[PDB]
Ligand binder design. Sequence first.
Ligand SMILES: *[C@@H]1O[C@H](CO)[C@@H](O)[C@H](O)[C@H]1NC(C)=O
Ligand SMILES: *[C@@H]1O[C@H](CO)[C@@H](O)[C@H](O)[C@H]1NC(C)=O
Lengths: 17, 49
Amino acid sequence: VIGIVNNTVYDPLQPEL
Amino acid sequence: SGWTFGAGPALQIPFPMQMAYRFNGIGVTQNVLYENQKLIANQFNSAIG
Ligand SMILES: *[C@@H]1O[C@H](CO)[C@@H](O)[C@H](O)[C@H]1NC(C)=O
Ligand SMILES: *[C@@H]1O[C@H](CO)[C@@H](O)[C@H](O)[C@H]1NC(C)=O
């Protein structure tokens, strides 16, 4: 993928469990 | 600006994403476009020529 940014993706499961 | 200028104000968008939206609009996910973007552009020139 071109110009894909190095950025974090949140997961709605790890904070919960 | 893709189709945004037709419906109102012209909203700039990178051409590859405009293509991505148009691909999504026909049932082909945008990752197909991004993974083959170079192939598609070179290929497009031969079609215009
Ligand atoms: C976006 O355009 C700039 C030039 O203004 C260029 O240096 C940069 O590499 C481009 N990024 C992509 C992903 O094409
Ligand atoms: C993104 O992170 C990886 C791992 O640190 C690194 O190898 C790569 O060069 C980084 N790319 C950008 C766009 O900074």
